[PDB]
Amino acid sequence: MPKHEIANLIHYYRKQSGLSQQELARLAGVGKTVIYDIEKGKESVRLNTLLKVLDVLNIQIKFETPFPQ
Amino acid sequence: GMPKHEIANLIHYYRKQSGLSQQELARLAGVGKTVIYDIEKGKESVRLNTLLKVLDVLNIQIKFETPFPQ
Ligand SMILES: [Cl-]
Numbered sequence: 001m002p003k004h005e006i007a008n009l010i011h012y013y014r015k016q017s018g019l020s021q022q023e024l025a026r027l028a029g030v031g032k033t034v035i036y037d038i039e040k041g042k043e044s045v046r047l048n049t050l051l052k053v054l055d056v057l058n059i060q061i062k063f064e065t066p067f068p069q
Numbered sequence: 070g071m072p073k074h075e076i077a078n079l080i081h082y083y084r085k086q087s088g089l090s091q092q093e094l095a096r097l098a099g100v101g102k103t104v105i106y107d108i109e110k111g112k113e114s115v116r117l118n119t120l121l122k123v124l125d126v127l128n129i130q131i132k133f134e135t136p137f138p139q
């Protein structure tokens with residue numbers, strides 16, 4: 001996956017939601033430093049942490065699979 | 070809201086269907102074998118970059134459902 005796909009994904013939909021990164025962190029119940037790191041392109045974020053951020057922004061994850069058709 | 074064991078069965082099913090052992094999938098993804106064991110047991114503390122290396126070996130890509138635009 002592109003290195004800044006999720007970075008811009010979180011930033012765009014957070015700015016479009018009017019949330020600061022402190023408000024998005026408080027809503028997701030995660031650390032403030034996590035929002036900074038994600039939007040900077042860092043991918044060492046734990047997934048249960050990332051999903052708590054995505055749900056506040058109403059973004060869900062689909063896995064496209066090689067089979068079946 | 071993604072359920073707590075979606076990733077565990079996703080990695081397990083497609084690793085079993087690919088004929089790869091836990092250690093075989095770990096060496097391809099460049100991660101520890103215990104990491105593969107922990108993912109399939111359900112723990113979601115797996116790191117994002119760690120997950121992406123496992124998914125890319127299994128030819129699984131992440132797509133995002135966004136609320137806008139239509
Ligand atoms: Cl900004």
Ligand SMILES: [Cl-]
Nearest residue numbers: 060061070071
């Ligand atoms: Cl999701």
Ligand SMILES: [Cl-]
Nearest residue numbers: 075078079082
């Ligand atoms: Cl599944």
